[PDB]
Amino acid sequence: MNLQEYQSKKLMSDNGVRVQRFFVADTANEALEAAKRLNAKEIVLKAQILAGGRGKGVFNSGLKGGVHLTKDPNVVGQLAKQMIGYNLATKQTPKEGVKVNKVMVAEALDISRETYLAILMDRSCNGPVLVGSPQGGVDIEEVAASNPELIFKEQIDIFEGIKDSQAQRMAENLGFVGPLKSQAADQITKLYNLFLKIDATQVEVNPFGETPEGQVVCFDAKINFDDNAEFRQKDIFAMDDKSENEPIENEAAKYDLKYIGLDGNIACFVNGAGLAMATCDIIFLNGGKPANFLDLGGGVKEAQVYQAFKLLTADPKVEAILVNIFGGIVNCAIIANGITKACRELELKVPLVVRLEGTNVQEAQKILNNSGLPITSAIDLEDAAKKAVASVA
Amino acid sequence: SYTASRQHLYVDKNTKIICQGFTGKQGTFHSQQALEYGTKLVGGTTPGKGGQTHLGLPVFNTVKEAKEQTGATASVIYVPPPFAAAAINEAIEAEIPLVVCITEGIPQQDMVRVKHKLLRQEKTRLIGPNCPGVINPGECKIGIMPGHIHKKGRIGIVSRSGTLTYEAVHQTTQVGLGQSLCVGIGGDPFNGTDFIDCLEIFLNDSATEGIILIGEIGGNAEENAAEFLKQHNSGPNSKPVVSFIAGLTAPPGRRMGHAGAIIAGGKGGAKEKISALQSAGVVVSMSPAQLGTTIYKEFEKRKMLENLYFQ
Ligand SMILES: CC(C)(COP(=O)(O)OP(=O)(O)OC[C@H]1O[C@@H](n2cnc3c(N)ncnc32)[C@H](O)[C@@H]1OP(=O)(O)O)[C@@H](O)C(=O)NCCC(=O)NCCS
Ligand SMILES: [Mg+2]
To answer: Where are the N6-acetyllysine modifications (chain A)?
Structure first.
């Protein structure tokens, strides 16, 4: 899932993390009013989209820049009217950009020094670890490649919680001295506790910043959430911003389906993450281009199979469909029933290669036979991939 | 240390099993199938139902009671995500030698907590979560893998993917080699058993003559296992290892179904794993369909080499 900037910063600010004070505006007039309300020396206006590169982006209104600074609320109003209801394109968006429905109006704070600070569930370390660097403002992977010695880490014991000594040493490691060490240490503690409360897999603050006036501030942040804790994070997941996701993925999520759109013309319909990845791979290995990844999970139900098959049949890029099922906890007849029910709605006009193995395969095969569908059978996964590729050669 | 519990992975005809989540939907169905398969399932747990009988077997409120009254040495968990970590914790507290957790969807923070307890003891070996289970064909099956595909044999299989395990089982049965022991370590980033755990059991098992290691994108467990195999499976008497790594075509920065299956920060790609395994002397099948035929060819090459130079 994804949060807009104003959503993550409120979440942090509501948990004692220091962010720049801000308001959110739906209209140019609200942006005007918010700007007056701030009583800030300088104001930064920020279009709310998820893609990066907002500052150098361009609106289809003609306006250059999705981030503007000014001291004058009228200028905030004039620029906002050139933002809201328009599409902001950046180096990380498609050419047509992303519609801007909201703008953030925030106090602009100078930054004296930029550091990096994150907390993540680190698989290598069996638990949470703090990750920090005095080299702020650059992707962490870049620092690791250039200057890995400037990457500091602390392993946090899940039951002890973060220790004062650990927050203090990381603050020192990031170059906060004297009064800003204790301040940064306190902010690190609050960020760690935020990280735990919200079932984040990562809370990444870049830059984690010190202002000329002696304030430690989280200027920008990115939070990744554990999908497995949605059941206890309903409020956060209700804020999910889906508007920059691939459309077919958004359709699949409505039915709890794991679908990932790829750059191909051979659709894949598979149970299991490993088998689904490998089906995409073996298509590539035999000289084809898979159109998607689709992982039917253990608890898939017939109505979900049905909706899943329709993600493929209604995709105009799809020129052939490779069904490959090795059923364990998945009953093959549920797959066959959902497929035949979906195909009852359309004149199937693409090749359909089908390979079925495992639980209840005999009954599933009979269901496919009774349908009268134009199915070309495959003896194994290599045979299926070769036939699917050839079917669109 | 926790490594001292690795031997508990090797279930056999003497393993006695209880089901956690006995009376639930999947607990009931897979317990029925285990009984019909002859596996020594002896009872199960559902809090608030101790004293009932299910499938002719006793139901208990707690693992401790179940273990004391049946002598069970293994538990299989079919408990839903909100409570499955407490279910693993209960089995650890009860000192059950082997715990197999099928459940998908346990919060990572829950499993970090479970792992903290797990690493500080050594009675209990955890397989999982989010895994198909473990099978010693014809002797003991604990999990969800399909029937009529296994054959007791010579190949040990360890896999982060359940469905790919079924493929490799089917392929090694079809080429006539069969499986000695098959362990699905599951697709979650925090789990109880890694590749190296299983490789140690395989390399020291006389019934295992070759190994299939099935991995995928994300993390660095395949890289670690490769270095382990390079150092400790490279002399004479070494055993052939064949691998397949899923996700060669996966896009970066996406979780490919598995919570653990993600190429993040430029790390976790399948190419880098294939190259590490290859440089360690593992033979990598590029195709997932060719695991049976690849390891069969490796056995035949070992035969020829042994007769050529090592009579
Ligand atoms: C674990 C899972 C199988 C449970 O699904 P389910 O059987 O349909 O769930 P149900 O709600 O019917 O049954 C769960 C049972 O656990 C019981 N339970 C709950 N907490 C428990 C605990 N701490 N200890 C024991 N039993 C517990 C419940 O009471 C319930 O039994 P009841 O209905 O008699 O009360 C499911 O969540 C799941 O993970 N499915 C996918 C598994 C998978 O694909 N794994 C990966 C394979 S590689
Ligand atoms: Mg699955």
So the answer is: 36, 95, 102, 163, 181, 190, 234, 254, 310, 349, 386
